[PDB]
Amino acid sequence: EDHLAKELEDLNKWGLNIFNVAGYSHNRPLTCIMYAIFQERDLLKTFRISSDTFITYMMTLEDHYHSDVAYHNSLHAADVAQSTHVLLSTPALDAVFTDLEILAAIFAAAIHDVDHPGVSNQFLINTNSELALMYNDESVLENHHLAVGFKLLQEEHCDIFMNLTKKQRQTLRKMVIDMVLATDMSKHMSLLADLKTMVETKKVTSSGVLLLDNYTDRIQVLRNMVHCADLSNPTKSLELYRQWTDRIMEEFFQQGDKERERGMEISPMCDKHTASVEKSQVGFIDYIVHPLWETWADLVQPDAQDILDTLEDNRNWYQSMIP
Ligand SMILES: CCOC(=O)c1c(C)nn(-c2cccc([N+](=O)[O-])c2)c1C
Ligand SMILES: [Mg+2]
Ligand SMILES: [Zn+2]
């Protein structure tokens, strides 16, 4: 109600508590936060999208995330979308992207885990699930999330890119596909090397504004920018990071419980009788989150310093939660 408005004063800030907005939106953060972002960047105006259209798409999209799934529900889509919108406002990337590119980034972030079943690519491959067979075991869920996001834009009343050029809509679909595929954890390490080499060639202007040559350079930053938004939980306030931990931990144990019935080998971080939730978070920050965010901060320094502090802080709170 009036509390929703209060929370959207932080739409442009990293400090947005998305759990709160979900509460003041009839349990619909992704719609809310998507509407709120597009209005804020005038994307509805710049791209001839009717609110009527945009709302019905987002609602249908949002209803396609499983609400009975602990982490990969509509709330997480809403959060990557909002994070990506903050990251896109980072000073070291000012006016570096076209609005077409900006529009592709956020939309990507929003459909990026759509219709996620609560289990891993590995589980679906090992169980011979229909999705694995449909997708020949390569970036399975990521391919799917994309398939669904775009299948909904085919229904006339739902196509939000309907008033986009044919050239532009194609450039979009190509950028969006590229980005969602980049959120596959198995491509993480190679994608980290790509960001590292790019940082060693970091060219800018006098104003601490990076210079990107063509597509290759601009879609790589956007690739990694979404990837970091997806792995942004350990850089948020402590109060929101633990809520996110409990949510992913609960999805992972429930995956463990399905792996046990089946008598498949359980994946240690998915084992609810052996796994330290605390150790799981420390390693995730040491081997995955920090190396990424260190390189991102290097790319945009000093824009991400505040974020790196909080990362190394939360990290040590979790270290302390161990005997
Ligand atoms: C908040 C703690 O996060 C986790 O420990 C954790 C681990 C491990 N993997 N992931 C994870 C799982 C599926 C997909 C992604 N990612 O693609 O965003 C990340 C998370 C959120
Ligand atoms: Mg995903
Ligand atoms: Zn995700």
Swiss-Prot record:
Changing Y318W: Changes substrate selectivity from cAMP-specific to dual cAMP and cGMP binding and hydrolysis. Expressed in brain, heart, lung and skeletal muscle. Expressed in white blood cells. 3',5'-cyclic AMP binds at H72, Q281, F284. Zn(2+) 1 binds at H76, H112, D113, D230. AMP binds at H72, H76, D113, D230, Q281, F284. Mn(2+) binds at D113. Residues 1-323 form the PDEase domain. The active site is at H72 (proton donor). Changing Y241Q: Changes substrate selectivity from cAMP-specific to dual cAMP and cGMP binding and hydrolysis. Mg(2+) binds at D113. Zn(2+) 2 binds at D113. Hydrolyzes the second messenger cAMP, which is a key regulator of many important physiological processes. May be involved in mediating central nervous system effects of therapeutic agents ranging from antidepressants to antiasthmatic and anti-inflammatory agents. Belongs to the cyclic nucleotide phosphodiesterase family. PDE4 subfamily. This is 3',5'-cyclic-AMP phosphodiesterase 4B. It comes from Homo sapiens. The lineage of its organism: Eukaryota, Metazoa, Chordata, Craniata, Vertebrata. The gene is PDE4B. The chain holds residues 335 to 657 of 736 of the full protein.
